[PDB]
Each structure stands twice: as structure tokens, then as C-alpha cells.
Design a protein around this ligand. Structure first.
Ligand SMILES: N[C@H](Cc1cc(C(=O)O)nn1-c1ccc(Br)cc1)C(=O)O
Lengths: 270, 280
């Protein structure tokens, strides 16, 4: 019985209250297909989980003959490595590594830092980084003057303890951007998007698969359009895991099957 | 040792094959030595190894891997098949050289798929691809799943669209969209470059093929008249990867190295050097 850790991140994971008798509301997409819901505990009552990643998890479970219980990551973070001398990963990365989770099913970015310590599947989703702003705000993209030499006038940020924070921390020529951002990063994507609507933050630098969905439903918000870096999401497993090979074979089969395309239709596109 | 037999395949700009420099006996500049086995005739298996020089996006990858993972290699070009197709449960192409242990890795425009992944190990993908669509600018298509491809005769006139047959694109469409496949056979193109001219001259409305190749061709098209769809509409998304023998001791360090190259900008520079063109 695999312990799945995930995180709140629409459209990949929606998190909604249960009904009164502890079951999940039955629901269909506007195209007439069942929305598959699973119970998921976390920061600590049961809740309803569904979305792109949940359908993937359900599809993987039936294909590979295992059962699961899903919980939301405690600290609500994706995972970076931090000094304690020892080092330790926070977020879902930390939970996977300590055995609190057997598998991360989330929009978890594949990068070299994490892959030193865990096994990723082949990507189940290819995407990139982009910039969300509130319509009214106008910028070139990643090379706008307001970004390449910041001030407190124009505040931009990302999520703390995320692949995006690592990406800016590791590259020597993003050094001024990083100093500006670390003093302004946010604890979650939603909080950063809400801070963009409220004008407290002027640019959010985050995963395009999330930002384009947010823009297409919250029409005060717009992305620039560019992807300035390309990256994929993968399933996270520990170095030993006997599920590694069959999980990625199933991801590959699902891309060639049109299945992933149906998921993209249902959840990601507008 | 850490000396490796490596197979590749000609497909610009990923692998470009040139005759040995004229003829100081050596490969110069951009290029690495690659040998090719050339048949004496088609009634025999006899041939001669011919010395050539290879360059390109994937060769530049091979060179960075060689230095970081610390290995040496003898590079040769595959002589039966292209990338890898299972013929009567038996593999040809680059995949075949790997599974039958003539080569321990395969480097080139080799697409990662499930069937291959059961008999070879694949590195992480280092360039993105999938099935894309190319049209002349002005034409209105979402992608492969457009109803305009799926039920062609719901539109008058019906669209003229095809692919090059006998490869992965045809096989994928046959499995997913059987009527589409039946319909477009009458529009088979015999190569990429004939399909491009049929597009630019009005004989074809759409060409369906490998996204990485189509993006390359669009970015360099004279007149900038040919366009592909946005990567959000690519079908069956996957990537080129490096194939290794099953259970290979190189897979972990090849994977970490490619992820280092992506994360630190080096892959982006290679894309600008070889793949990005004058259009868009
Ligand atoms: N890289 C080649 C495959 C490439 C050429 C073929 C063709 O000739 O049709 N189509 N693709 C292709 C690429 C990705 C996907 Br998903 C589907 C088709 C390979 O490795 O075989």
C-alpha cells in the first residue's frame, strides 16, 4: 500500500472539503466524463483530491496492481536542500527521502539537484517557466529592465523552496534577480497569485502549466507568453523502488495512447 | 574499459555526415571521426569500412558527455535500418545495434518510446519532440486531434494532409485514429523535403511529423511561410534520448550530466547553435 504525497496545485491537484458523510461529491466534466476523486488527509482532516495528477495516479494504480493512500505534504513545499554539517531536504523531497512517502505524485520538476537523490519517471508533462502579471502591468518578459535590475518599485518573486528558487539560486548570471527574489518569495503558488491580483506583487515567475491555466480563468491576470526555460514534471520515487521501471513505461504508453492528451484536454487547456 | 562502441545515424542538424577533409586524412574543426560500412553491391553482405566525419547537435552532446562522464568512444553509423523498428520481433536500426551488443549506446535523433524502452535503457530526454503539424501561414489547425483531421469529410473541401509513411508517425496515427490513417494514405509524401515543397506550392494543406524536425524546418524556411503549432498542442509528447544497453553502468552518470547541461544553460547554447533559425 503505497503512501502517496502530493501538494495543492491547480489544475494538477484540486483539494476540496468532503461531504457530510465523509464521501466526495460526484461530478462530471462539461464534456460528460466522470471526475475521479480520492480521499486525501492533510494540514488534519480528510478532504477530496482530484485533477490531472490524480487521474494519472488512478491510471498508474490499475495498470501496475497497487493500492494507495494520499496525503498532502506537511510543510506545503515542493522541496529544496538546506543546511542543518549535514544537509536535509524540506518539502515532498524530504518526505520521500525519510520514508514518510513512497512516491511523489505532483507537478514535481525534474532537475539535477533532486535527481542526485531520487529516481524520476520519464516526464509525464513537458512545460516551462513564464511570468504571470496583472493585466495593466506590461513587461517584455524575462529581460525587461524592471527585472534585469530590480528595485522596490517593481516586486517580482517565486515560491520558496521550489525548483524555481533553486534555478535562480544556482546560476551566476541570475545573481541580482535572485537577491531581489529571496526577500519576496511566497510560501505557495496560490498566495503568490492572490498577491498579484491584490497588487502587492507585480510579477510571479512560475510553471507555465499552472500560470496559463490561472490566466485563462482569472482574466485580470495575463502571462507574457514566452517560456524562458523548459522543464518537465516527473513521478518521484526513492533510489531503490521496484516501481521505477514500470511507472515510466506506463507514462510512455500513456503519451502514445492519447491518454495524456485527454488529461491535457480535460484539465490543462482553455 | 571506459572505451565505448557507439552507433549514430545521419539526420541534419542532429548528425551531419561529411567526407573526410580533402584529404589530410583527418577530421577537422567541428567534427569527430565516424566510420561507415559501405556494401560492395546489394547481392552481398561484403563491404568496406569508410572513414567519415560527423558533426551536429547530437555530436556536440556526445562530446560534452565524453568529457564529463570521462569515456572514449569509437563512433560508427548504422547500416541497416534507421532509428529502430521491430521487424518480425527482430530490431534493425540504431536500437538493433544496441540490443544485439554491437554498440553500448546510441546517439542521434532517437525518440524515446515504450516498445524500445522494454529492450534498451534511455537517458533523460535532451530535446523535446512529439507529433506536430506544419501548415502555410494563414491555415487554422490546433493539432493532430483537430476534428478537421479526425473526420476529414465533415468539411468541404476536405483537407489534404499527410506524413512520410513507414515510420513512427504513421504507426502512431494508425493505432489512435484509424479513419484518419485510412484517409491520409492518398497523401503520403516520400520525404520531408518533398512534403515541404508540396506545402509551399499548394499541393498539400498540412504535413504531420516529428515536432523537433518540423520546428527546425520552419525556423529556416525561406520566406518564413511555414508554421507549426504551439508546443502545448504537440501530440504524444516525448523527447530524443540516448539509448544504452539494458542495465548499463553509464545510465546514472549520463542522466545526471544531461540534467546538468539543461539546468546550467549549456543545452540552450547548443540549441541556439544548431536548431534555432532565422524565422520567429
Ligand atoms: N525520431 C524518429 C521518429 C521521428 C521520425 C518519424 C517518421 O519517420 O515518421 N516520426 N518521428 C516521430 C518522433 C516522435 C513521435 Br511521439 C512520433 C513520430 C525515431 O526515433 O524513430
Amino acid at each position: 500500500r503505497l503512501k502517496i504525497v502530493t501538494i495543492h496545485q491547480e489544475p494538477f491537484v484540486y483539494v476540496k472539503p468532503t461531504m457530510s458523510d465523509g464521501t466526495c461529491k460526484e461530478e462530471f466534466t462539461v464534456n460528460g466524463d466522470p471526475v475521479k476523486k480520492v480521499i486525501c488527509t492533510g494540514p488534519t482532516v480528510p478532504q477530496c483530491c482530484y485533477g490531472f495528477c490524480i487521474d494519472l495516479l488512478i491510471k498508474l494504480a490499475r495498470t501496475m496492481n497497487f493500492t494507495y493512500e494520499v496525503h498532502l505534504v506537511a510543510d506545503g513545499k515542493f522541496g529544496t536542500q538546506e543546511r542543518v554539517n549535514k544537509k536535509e531536504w524540506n518539502g515532498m523531497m524530504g518526505e520521500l527521502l525519510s520514508g514518510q512517502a513512497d512516491m511523489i505524485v505532483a507537478p514535481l520538476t525534474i532537475n539535477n539537484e533532486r535527481a542526485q537523490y531520487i529516481e524520476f519517471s520519464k516526464p509525464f508533462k513537458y512545460q516551462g517557466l513564464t511570468i504571470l502579471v496583472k493585466k495593466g502591468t506590461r513587461i517584455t518578459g524575462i529581460n525587461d529592465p524592471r527585472l534585469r535590475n530590480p528595485s522596490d518599485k517593481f516586486i517580482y518573486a517565486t515560491v520558496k523552496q521550489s525548483s524555481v528558487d533553486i534555478y535562480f539560486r544556482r546560476q551566476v548570471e541570475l545573481s541580482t534577480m535572485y537577491r531581489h527574489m529571496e526577500k519576496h518569495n511566497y510560501e505557495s503558488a496560490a498566495e503568490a497569485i492572490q498577491a498579484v491580483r491584490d497588487n502587492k506583487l507585480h510579477a510571479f515567475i512560475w510553471d507555465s502549466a499552472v500560470l496559463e491555466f490561472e490566466a485563462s480563468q482569472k482574466c485580470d491576470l495575463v502571462t507574457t507568453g514566452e517560456l524562458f526555460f523548459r522543464s518537465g514534471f516527473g513521478i518521484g520515487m526513492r533510489k531503490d523502488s521496484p516501481w521505477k521501471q514500470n511507472v515510466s513505461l506506463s507514462i510512455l504508453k500513456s503519451h502514445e495512447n492519447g491518454f495524456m492528451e485527454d488529461l491535457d484536454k480535460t484539465w490543462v487547456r482553455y | 574499459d571506459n572505451h565505448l562502441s557507439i552507433v549514430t545515424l545521419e539526420e541534419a542538424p542532429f548528425v551531419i555526415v561529411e567526407d573526410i577533409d580533402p584529404l589530410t586524412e583527418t577530421c577537422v574543426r567541428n567534427t569527430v571521426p565516424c566510420r561507415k560500412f559501405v556494401k560492395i553491391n546489394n547481392s552481398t553482405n561484403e563491404g568496406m569500412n569508410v572513414k567519415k566525419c560527423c558533426k551536429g547537435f547530437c555530436i556536440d552532446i556526445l562530446k560534452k558527455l565524453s568529457r564529463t562522464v570521462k569515456f572514449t568512444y569509437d563512433l560508427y553509423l548504422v547500416t541497416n535500418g534507421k532509428h529502430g523498428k521491430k521487424v518480425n520481433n527482430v530490431w534493425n536500426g540504431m536500437i538493433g545495434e544496441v540490443v544485439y551488443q554491437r554498440a553500448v549506446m546510441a546517439v542521434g535523433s532517437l525518440t524515446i518510446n515504450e516498445e524500445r524502452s522494454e529492450v534498451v535503457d534511455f537517458s533523460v530526454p535532451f530535446v523535446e519532440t512529439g507529433i506536430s503539424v506544419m501548415v502555410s501561414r494563414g491555415t487554422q489547425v490546433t493539432g493532430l486531434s483537430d476534428k478537421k483531421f479526425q473526420r476529414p469529410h465533415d468539411y468541404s473541401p476536405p483537407f489534404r494532409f499527410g506524413t512520410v509513411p513507414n515510420g513512427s508517425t504513421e504507426r502512431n496515427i494508425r493505432n489512435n485514429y484509424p479513419y484518419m490513417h485510412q484517409y491520409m494514405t492518398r497523401f503520403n509524401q516520400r520525404g520531408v523535403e518533398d512534403a515541404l515543397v508540396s506545402l509551399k506550392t499548394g499541393k498539400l494543406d498540412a504535413f504531420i511529423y516529428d515536432a523537433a524536425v518540423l520546428n527546425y524546418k520552419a525556423g529556416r524556411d525561406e520566406g518564413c511561410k511555414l508554421v507549426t503549432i504551439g508546443s502545448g498542442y504537440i501530440f504524444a509528447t516525448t523527447g530524443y534520448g540516448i539509448a544504452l544497453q539494458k542495465g548499463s553502468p553509464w545510465k546514472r552518470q549520463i542522466d545526471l550530466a544531461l540534467l546538468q547541461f539543461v539546468g546550467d544553460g549549456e543545452m540552450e547554447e547548443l540549441e541556439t547553435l544548431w536548431l534555432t533559425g532565422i524565422c520567429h
